[PDB]
Amino acid sequence: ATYAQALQSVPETQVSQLDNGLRVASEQSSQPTCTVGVWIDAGSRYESEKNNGAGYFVEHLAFKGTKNRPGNALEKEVESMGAHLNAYSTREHTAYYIKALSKDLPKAVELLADIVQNCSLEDSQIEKERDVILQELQENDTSMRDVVFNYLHATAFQGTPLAQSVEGPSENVRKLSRADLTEYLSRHYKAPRMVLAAAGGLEHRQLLDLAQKHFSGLSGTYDEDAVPTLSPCRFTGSQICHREDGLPLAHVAIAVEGPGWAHPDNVALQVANAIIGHYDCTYGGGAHLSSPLASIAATNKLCQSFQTFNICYADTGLLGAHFVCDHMSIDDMMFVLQGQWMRLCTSATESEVLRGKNLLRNALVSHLDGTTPVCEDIGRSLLTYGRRIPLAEWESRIAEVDARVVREVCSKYFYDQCPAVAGFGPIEQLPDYNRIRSGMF
Amino acid sequence: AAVPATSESPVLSVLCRESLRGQAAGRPLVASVSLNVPASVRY
Amino acid sequence: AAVPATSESPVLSVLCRESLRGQAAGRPLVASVSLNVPASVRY
Amino acid sequence: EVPPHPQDLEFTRLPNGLVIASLENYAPASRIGLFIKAGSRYENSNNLGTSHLLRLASSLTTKGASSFKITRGIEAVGGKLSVTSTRENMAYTVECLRDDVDILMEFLLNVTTAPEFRRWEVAALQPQLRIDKAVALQNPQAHVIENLHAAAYRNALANSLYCPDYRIGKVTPVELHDYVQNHFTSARMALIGLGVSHPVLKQVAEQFLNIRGGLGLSGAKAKYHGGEIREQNGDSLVHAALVAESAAIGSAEANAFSVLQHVLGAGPHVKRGSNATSSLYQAVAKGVHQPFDVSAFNASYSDSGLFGFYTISQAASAGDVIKAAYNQVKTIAQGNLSNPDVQAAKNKLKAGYLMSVESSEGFLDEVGSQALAAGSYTPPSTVLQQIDAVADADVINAAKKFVSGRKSMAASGNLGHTPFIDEL
Amino acid sequence: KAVALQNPQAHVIENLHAAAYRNALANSLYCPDYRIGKVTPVELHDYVQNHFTSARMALIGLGVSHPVLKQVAEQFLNIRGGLGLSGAKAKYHGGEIREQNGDSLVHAALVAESAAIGSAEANAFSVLQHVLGAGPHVKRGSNATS
Amino acid sequence: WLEGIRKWYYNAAGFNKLGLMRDDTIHENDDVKEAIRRLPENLYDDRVFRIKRALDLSMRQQILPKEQWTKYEEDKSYLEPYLKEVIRERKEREEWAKK
Amino acid sequence: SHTDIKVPDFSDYRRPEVLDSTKSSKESSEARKGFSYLVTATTTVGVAY
Numbered sequence A: 001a002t003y004a005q006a007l008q009s010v011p012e013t014q015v016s017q018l019d020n021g022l023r024v025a026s027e028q029s030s031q032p033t034c035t036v037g038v039w040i041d042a043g044s045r046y047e048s049e050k051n052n053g054a055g056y057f058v059e060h061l062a063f064k065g066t067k068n069r070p071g072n073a074l075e076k077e078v079e080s081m082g083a084h085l086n087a088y089s090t091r092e093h094t095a096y097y098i099k100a101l102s103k104d105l106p107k108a109v110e111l112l113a114d115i116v117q118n119c120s121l122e123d124s125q126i127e128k129e130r131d132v133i134l135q136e137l138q139e140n141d142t143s144m145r146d147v148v149f150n151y152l153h154a155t156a157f158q159g160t161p162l163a164q165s166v167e168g169p170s171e172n173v174r175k176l177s178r179a180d181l182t183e184y185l186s187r188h189y190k191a192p193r194m195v196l197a198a199a200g201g202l203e204h205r206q207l208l209d210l211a212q213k214h215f216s217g218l219s220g221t222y223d224e225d226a227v228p229t230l231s232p233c234r235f236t237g238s239q240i241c242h243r244e245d246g247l248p249l250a251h252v253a254i255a256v257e258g259p260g261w262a263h264p265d266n267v268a269l270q271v272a273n274a275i276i277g278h279y280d281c282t283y284g285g286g287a288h289l290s291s292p293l294a295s296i297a298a299t300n301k302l303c304q305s306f307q308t309f310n311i312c313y314a315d316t317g318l319l320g321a322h323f324v325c326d327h328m329s330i331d332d333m334m335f336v337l338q339g340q341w342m343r344l345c346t347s348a349t350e351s352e353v354l355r356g357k358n359l360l361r362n363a364l365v366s367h368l369d370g371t372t373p374v375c376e377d378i379g380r381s382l383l384t385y386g387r388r389i390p391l392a393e394w395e396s397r398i399a400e401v402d403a404r405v406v407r408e409v410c411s412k413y414f415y416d417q418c419p420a421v422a423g424f425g426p427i428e429q430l431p432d433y434n435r436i437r438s439g440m441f
Numbered sequence B, C: 001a002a003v004p005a006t007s008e009s010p011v012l013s014v015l016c017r018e019s020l021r022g023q024a025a026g027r028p029l030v031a032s033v034s035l036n037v038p039a040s041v042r043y
Numbered sequence D: 001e002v003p004p005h006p007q008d009l010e011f012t013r014l015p016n017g018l019v020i021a022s023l024e025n026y027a028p029a030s031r032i033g034l035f036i037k038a039g040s041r042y043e044n045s046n047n048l049g050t051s052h053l054l055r056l057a058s059s060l061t062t063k064g065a066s067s068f069k070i071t072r073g074i075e076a077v078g079g080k081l082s083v084t085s086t087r088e089n090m091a092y093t094v095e096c097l098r099d100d101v102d103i104l105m106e107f108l109l110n111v112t113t114a115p116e117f118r119r120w121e122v123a124a125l126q127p128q129l130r131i132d133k134a135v136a137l138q139n140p141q142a143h144v145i146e147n148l149h150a151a152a153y154r155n156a157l158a159n160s161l162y163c164p165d166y167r168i169g170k171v172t173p174v175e176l177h178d179y180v181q182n183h184f185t186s187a188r189m190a191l192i193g194l195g196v197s198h199p200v201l202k203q204v205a206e207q208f209l210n211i212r213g214g215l216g217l218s219g220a221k222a223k224y225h226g227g228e229i230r231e232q233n234g235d236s237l238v239h240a241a242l243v244a245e246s247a248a249i250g251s252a253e254a255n256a257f258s259v260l261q262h263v264l265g266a267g268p269h270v271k272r273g274s275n276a277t278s279s280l281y282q283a284v285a286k287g288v289h290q291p292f293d294v295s296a297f298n299a300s301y302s303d304s305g306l307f308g309f310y311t312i313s314q315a316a317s318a319g320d321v322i323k324a325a326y327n328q329v330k331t332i333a334q335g336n337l338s339n340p341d342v343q344a345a346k347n348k349l350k351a352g353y354l355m356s357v358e359s360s361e362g363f364l365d366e367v368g369s370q371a372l373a374a375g376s377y378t379p380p381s382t383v384l385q386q387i388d389a390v391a392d393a394d395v396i397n398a399a400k401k402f403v404s405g406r407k408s409m410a411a412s413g414n415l416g417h418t419p420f421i422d423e424l
Numbered sequence E: 001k002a003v004a005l006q007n008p009q010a011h012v013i014e015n016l017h018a019a020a021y022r023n024a025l026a027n028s029l030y031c032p033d034y035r036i037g038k039v040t041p042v043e044l045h046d047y048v049q050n051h052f053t054s055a056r057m058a059l060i061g062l063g064v065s066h067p068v069l070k071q072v073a074e075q076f077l078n079i080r081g082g083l084g085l086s087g088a089k090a091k092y093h094g095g096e097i098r099e100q101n102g103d104s105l106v107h108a109a110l111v112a113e114s115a116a117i118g119s120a121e122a123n124a125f126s127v128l129q130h131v132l133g134a135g136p137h138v139k140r141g142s143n144a145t146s
Numbered sequence F: 001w002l003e004g005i006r007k008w009y010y011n012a013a014g015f016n017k018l019g020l021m022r023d024d025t026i027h028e029n030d031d032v033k034e035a036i037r038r039l040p041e042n043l044y045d046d047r048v049f050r051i052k053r054a055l056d057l058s059m060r061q062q063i064l065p066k067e068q069w070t071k072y073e074e075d076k077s078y079l080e081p082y083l084k085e086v087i088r089e090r091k092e093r094e095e096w097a098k099k
Numbered sequence G: 001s002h003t004d005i006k007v008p009d010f011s012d013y014r015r016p017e018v019l020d021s022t023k024s025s026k027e028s029s030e031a032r033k034g035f036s037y038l039v040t041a042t043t044t045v046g047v048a049y
């Protein structure tokens, strides 16, 4: 078949909803294994300065025992059936998911229901996790990449909830109480804020009945005065430079404000980012890479690596790049990078945009490879778009992009716009903000 | 190609059981090199 | 003192038994460092 | 929704020995891989590291396509070309949208059957060996596993996946040509495809992969020896692995070892969990209260295998963790193994296998490896049955084989408190 | 270290000791690479204070009068520290270290634990050494009695 | 008449009198520099000595004894295969730059 | 922890139109830039004269 007919053969994702508001979505395949999980509209963007880190603390407690399965009982059950239980928290979403044999879907759904509704939160466990989290904060401090990205959010979204890290400040970790957590939970873990998603060898009808059976008790009301809604987050052209000449390589992240999840412009932006691409010293292409930034960097040894990114949030986002380089290569790297954004705004060619479109097509499909990536796409999509966008639609959106669309969309977000800049390490050579700003036009 | 590796390599973490868990090797290693993606080493 | 070492060291073969004879080690090694003379390593 | 299909795997072995295997999944993208018996085990004392450079030379000039064209051509269609190697096999894989398979296939064939290894391009690529190795060796596990193999075998499997330092800048074009000529032959290859029709792959293999080869110690049986390599580097944490010869992949005994691996504990199942059902982990936890990690280690090759455990601990606790882990395996060898523990292990193993062939990468690796190892295809249902067939006594016997077998050990870190094999 | 290691014998003899002993005598005369740039002033002070002690020292002189050397030692080497910090006894283990480097020539050493210096058995080994051959006696000779 | 005139021109040109081969006299542009960089050691070293010998003769306003003059019949292009490929590669990059 | 790092308050320096953290500043970006551009264009013409 052609790439076109193959697109129309992907089973359509089935979506249902319970009385309490919980959405149930699934994509059936014939895999003897599956992934099922709960995606929640909860994250640090929903936290205030007082409880920032609450969600991450809960993630630490989620698998430590439930009222029905105290202590390591939940753990033993997951392990004995050979399943895998994982979780993650971001500034807007939280997810708990299980990879298991398709025949074990009923127990998998029960366990998730149990986890999301009956978490013990034993005072002694809370004290133990407190120390674990503090140690994780210390470890994260050694990850220059994680530090620079937290810094980018701190400065770009300064004064708003998006400026907050997911883990929260250490003093919050030392002071968060069970009361704080149960409070956070009663407020955010409601059925209308959750999506039960599954992908693999199972039928929607079976998942739906299991959901009715195990999630019906989940609250779908809350009230009116306590319905955590999101306010837009102001973006600020600014710079944060943490100079540390003791570190061997400098990390720099720069971005302009992105449009947010729902905007159609994200497709063209993804095409443009694909044109500039990514790179690191282990890439075999070197001097022949198609991206001018990549080949210049490789032939002139300008950096160890770089990556463009389009981080999306509800109504805003960070569109830009991150690079790692020697202290004497920062200005050159910034010069070439900004020159490439400007070239795309004013002179993107049909041939490079086609390449970008093909890169995006390949990335889209190769990403949805396996029950876990698919299940995550279902969960997240339902939370963000309110629907699963089919591949055939993505193709239509990508197809609509041409050189004209790329120049116009890039001009809209990059041209003469104030960026947010974060630097960490031996950054004496990181350009002054005025010089960076002038580089935007 | 299109998808960047999970971890990008540069040349020239752990402080708790939780973050140490999974680091012990369990299988023979595999070495991969790419045209478009960061190299990797498994197990 | 002014007696340079027998062999001066530089930093940054044998092709016959005769020239190989004596090269095999026979005793523990000694390492010497000097103020005025090249360092040496015995055996 | 209700999907189309599911179709079955099509398998075909040609007269020259080349295996072709494909699965039509009707996906929008295709994944094709050429598996070759050319891993590092086939290098000998005079050309160590040649296969590492070969792995990094996939985009050098070929008879039908220049280095420049290979890179620009593959990128034009947003495609991918990668080379993956283990101690026994080398796998060249291409990924692209299904309408562009013709393009990726042409480059794939040029890279594997018509490389030129031009003198100046080969010289210019040498430095990359240093960069690639430095990146991989940032992982202590790499140090330990490479040393473990070097300590365990007298040859073949003893070879590292990475070029020795003294060979960097010394690998010649002739060595590369000889290596490709002696190993990239029809009877040593498997052409695997996903989202591609069996007829086209069959056609491609028949017309471009009909190759007879030279010599392919490029056949040499791996000779288990046993020994230990200790790498002192003063790191706060000590990484160590202790193994004994186990069994060749494909044997029933190999299945016993895989089940034993999961009885002992073969990796985490719960994010930040206490690994309640991991035998080795719970045994160490009772005695050591400092951070540590432990896991059963299982490596199975065509003519041999290594089984044991891997530990990570603070330097002062190395002895306590290693001894506690070892003693725990000794109790299994003495028969202290419950049926429930074995069934749980079987569940983890079965669920684990199925999960590993869930993605195109895992699927391809599984089919390609079977194709080169047994020149046949054993389906999931049969694998699971072979797993259920393992008896509690087989597991106990595998443990015994480990305990009484001559050991091989590798450790790195501040080894002041890390014991020697004879102290275990 | 780079200068000393230009001699293959140095590589082999250092590895030989590392292979033979579990500790003490297993240590190399040369600083391990990972430690270069890491040896601290405190470690140097600690080392001198634990080992440069009176009961571990001997002042020897040739071409000087005993009285002057005696008065020098009495007035300026009247330190203390006694026997200082002796080490653990060397524990012979046995083992092998193979260093592949592709040189046209292979250097190798094979040993077994013999005897401590000062014992009568040590003398037997010294004589055995010369029976087997302990170095050339004639420039370019054929070593007829080795 | 292009063989009789050729040998006549070759000698009138006279680089052979300095012991040079025709390729030793080519004007070096970027294609030529890359071609020379690709020469195997022996051809590179031979080229270096012939040029050095010629420059020395030139400095002394002298020429080699007639029996050492490069012979028209023996002068072959050692550079051609390398230069041709360098130009071919460049042309390929140029065609791709136009897409 | 690097997460103890919060950008200091700049409210005493911000232009009035970007003082509300719950509002996008993209609505005033055109006006804020248009003014500076006006200042630069007028200077250029003055100097040219």
Ligand SMILES: CCCCCCO[C@@H]1O[C@H](CO)[C@@H](O)[C@H](O)[C@H]1O
Binding pocket: A264, A389, A390, A392, A393, A394, A396, A397, A398, A400
């Ligand atoms: C830039 C183009 C924006 C609109 C793209 C819509 O695209 C359409 O979406 C439908 C529903 O998902 C699909 O069924 C249909 O096949 C697809 O072509």
Ligand SMILES: CCCCCCO[C@@H]1O[C@H](CO)[C@@H](O)[C@H](O)[C@H]1O
Binding pocket: A286, D059, D060, D061, D066, D067, D068, D120, D121, D122, D124, D125, F034, F086, F089, F090, F093
């Ligand atoms: C890093 C190892 C060498 C990679 C092979 C590409 O090699 C390059 O090919 C170009 C043709 O496009 C030539 O013009 C260039 O001189 C050559 O170095």
